[PDB]
Amino acid sequence: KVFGRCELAAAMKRHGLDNYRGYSLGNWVCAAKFESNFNTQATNRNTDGSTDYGILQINSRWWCNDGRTPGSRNLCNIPCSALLSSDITASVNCAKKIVSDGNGMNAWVAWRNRCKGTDVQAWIRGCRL
Template sequence: GMKAAGIFALIGCLVTSTESKLYTRCKLAQIFARAGLDNYAGFSLGNWICMAYYESGYNTTAETILEDGSIDYGIFQINSYTWCRYAKLQEKNHCHVACSALVTDDLTDAIICAKKIVKETQGMNYWQGWKKHCEGKDLSEWKKGCDV
């Protein structure tokens, strides 16, 4: 069963400020499907929706500062140290993108980067939220009632 259904209903009703975009589950499902995430690298759409929920609560502007000083950005909480460019610090920037591009309403850059992470790190284990809450579970509920 899925206790989270009530939480989703709540999230859908939240009025958000202009700076921060909080997508609904079904809107994200549509965006993810259009971007080719369904079964990308063998991961069903439910995996992506579940992961985004547990990483950011679907908040495109989420930023988390970690103990090592790096920052996790956006809907997928992508880390600055390896994956994006923060200010003048090049670090590794494997996604060839500014970290600021990962916290906009347009999810294109975040999705391209997430695809790269999945390909380069062998799957979705990069995301602790996915490992803990989504891996090996029946994830069909996550796109239930959505037009995808």
Template sequence: MKAAGTLALMGCLITVVEPKIYTRCKLAKIFSRAGLDNYRGFSLGNWICMAYYESHYNTTAQTDLEDGSTDYGIFKINSYTWCRRAKLQEKNHCHVACSDLITDDLTDAIICAKKIVKETEGMNYWQGWKKHCEGKDLSEWKKGCELS
């Protein structure tokens, strides 16, 4: 009886991060409400395009890099500079745990992405954006989405 109760409690404590893959229009609405449209001069299309090429809109996306760091979440934010895993030498400029960047709640990821754009050279931080979105007509990325 005691073992069953312990197992049930352990089951409640274990959290499983299930992938949430947003649709383009759902993300457009979230990004718009979060003030990303024209944030630092970057249209909503830039943000939607970048998120697609970085993570394919997958909130739990992770990529381990050769330098030992990891890119996390829908924006693929790097652990060495922007978030904290467990290593003290990581800079953690966004003052956030990397695990907070791979949840369905995009608040921390958006706040951190804004900080990256503000404190670096705009959206040049993201290779997916530079390769696929920079300098292109991005109006198609929000086409058909009911934005207020």
């Protein structure tokens, strides 16, 4: 599913991301924009052989099982395919664990490089939320 911007904002807010770990909703919308282009089916293969999955590009080295990331863990207790679903509950729930791991949203390189320190509000402009 390719979410609209406000559509994704509303879903993330329902699922309790707004201000989770102190990160405003716009941070999460911005991260999803640059990570997945709002596409739940986004997949990216990393140099280390792991893969990123879904709207928030959750990585198989630590967070989900894809059966092909040697030495990896599955800390969210899900198949990485769960993360490609049109429904974002699994992605949002795993994201809560990742952002809680110690470095906040810096866990998403694209957030650090593209969203962090920017006017992340803008991402929820116009949304009736």
